[PDB]
Design a protein around this ligand. Structure first.
Ligand SMILES: Cc1cc2nc3c(=O)[nH]c(=O)nc-3n(C[C@H](O)[C@H](O)[C@H](O)COP(=O)(O)O)c2cc1C
Ligand SMILES: Cc1cc(Nc2ccc(C(F)(F)F)cc2)n2nc(C(C)(F)F)nc2n1
Ligand SMILES: O=C(O)c1cc(=O)[nH]c(=O)[nH]1
Length: 368
């Protein structure tokens, strides 16, 4: 209980009941931009730290893509106690997205429907923002070791999806701790997808070539090493194409997989009966967890997993890991539970880890 968190969460509870979803979002992002949000300055339990390959996360909680699409509020979101943030999904050139209002929420069910249609300032401007953050990070004790990933995607009317992701890697790759391939927005063909992943890895490695500087100056990023490659998957898939994707990921030795994006396969919300778009929140929890189990099966525990979503509590979080999720991303929780989300969930998971018998977090990964 940090007083500052409780005070803001009254205003946020008010904002939730009354104000438009996206207008709130933008206001809080704006607040964070001018550095007036609370910090979590506490020490994270070394027993609860985690990693994906050589990418080390000080704690298992980050913020999902679509939250800070333009990377304007990275410091403050991180400093709420998150280990990482995944900015974007960015596109090569700026987009307005769909028509407003395009995001709607339901308190009762703790869910969100959205059809943003990939609005973002474009790569050039977002890269400009990330550079500015990376400079600050060198002069801020609270941002050390904190991971920033970049979710990349195509424009709504792109000629070929691969050519777009290359342009993005060329601008932002230097400054990303990892790259999340986004082709899972509700708003693929095995070989078509396989082609993409290999393009990305091939394209990242070209950045190391063309530079005359050592890697240490090559990576203006937390790792100081080349970006890892994650792929994000949509849940609305057959047991067949889920098998087909799993091999592709194995054949490309992809660094990890984000499971999962939003669904359209939910019909049982009375306020959502009106609206169009993908759905996230509590009603996505159980569907998303089964998906992780499934993809953990067809992958033989070889490719690490980033979990999302429906994650609101340490309990919810633990399910994902036992299922075998290495790390977790939150989006809906910050909307409903608020600014204490990171502090609350980290605490709750620390308690539960002890009671279940687990020594460290890593021992809980992939245990029924
Ligand atoms: C308004 C909104 C925008 C989103 N934008 C993106 C996006 O641009 N890229 C992406 O990969 N996921 C996006 N997502 C999905 C989230 O990243 C997350 O995976 C999903 O919300 C499920 O997690 P949650 O139920 O805990 O929120 C968006 C979700 C919402 C609600
Ligand atoms: C009140 C509120 C706040 C908010 N966004 C929001 C919540 C926390 C923070 C933090 F950084 F934690 F301070 C920042 C932004 N959203 N987002 C949406 C959505 C779903 F439309 F996208 N509805 C919202 N309603
Ligand atoms: O930009 C969007 O509309 C969007 C992207 C995404 O990946 N997921 C989502 O729910 N919305």
């Amino acid at each position: 209980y940090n007083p500052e968190f409780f005070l803001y969460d009254i205003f946020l509870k008010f904002c939730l009941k009354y104000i438009d979803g996206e207008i709130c979002h933008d206001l809080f992002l704006l607040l964070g931009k001018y550095n007036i949000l609370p910090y979590d300055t506490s020490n994270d339990s070394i027993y609860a730290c985690t990693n994906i390959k050589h990418l080390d996360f000080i704690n298992p909680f980050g913020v999902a893509a679509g939250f800070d699409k333009n990377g304007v509020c990275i410091d403050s979101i991180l400093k709420l106690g998150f280990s990482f943030i995944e900015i974007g999904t960015i596109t090569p050139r700026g987009q307005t997205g769909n028509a407003k209002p395009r995001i709607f929420r339901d308190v009762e069910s703790r869910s969100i429907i959205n059809s943003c249609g990939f609005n973002n300032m474009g790569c050039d401007k977002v890269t400009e923002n990330l550079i500015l953050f990376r400079k600050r990070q060198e002069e801020d004790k609270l941002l050390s070791k904190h991971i920033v990933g970049v979710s990349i995607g195509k424009n709504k009317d792109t000629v070929n999806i691969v050519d777009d992701l290359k342009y993005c890697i060329n601008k932002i790759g230097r400054y990303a701790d990892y790259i999340a391939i986004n082709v899972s927005s509700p708003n693929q063909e095995a070989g078509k997808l396989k082609n993409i992943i290999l393009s990305v890895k091939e394209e990242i490695d070209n950045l190391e070539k063309n530079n005359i500087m050592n890697d240490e100056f090559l990576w203006f990023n937390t790792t100081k090493k080349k970006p890892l490659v994650f792929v994000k998957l949509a849940p609305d898939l057959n047991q067949e194409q889920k098998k087909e994707i799993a091999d592709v990921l194995l054949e490309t030795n992809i660094d990890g997989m984000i499971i999962s994006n939003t669904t359209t396969q939910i019909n049982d919300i009375k306020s959502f009966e009106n609206k169009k778009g993908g759905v996230s929140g509590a009603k996505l929890k159980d569907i998303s967890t089964k998906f992780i189990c499934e993809m953990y099966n067809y992958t033989n525990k070889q490719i690490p997993i980033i979990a999302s979503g429906g994650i609101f509590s340490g309990l919810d979080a633990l399910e994902k890991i036992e299922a075998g999720a290495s790390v977790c991303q939150l989006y809906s929780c910050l909307v409903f539970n608020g600014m204490k989300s990171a502090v609350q969930i980290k605490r709750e998971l620390n308690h539960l880890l002890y009671q279940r018998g687990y020594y460290n977090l890593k021992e809980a990964i992939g245990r029924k």
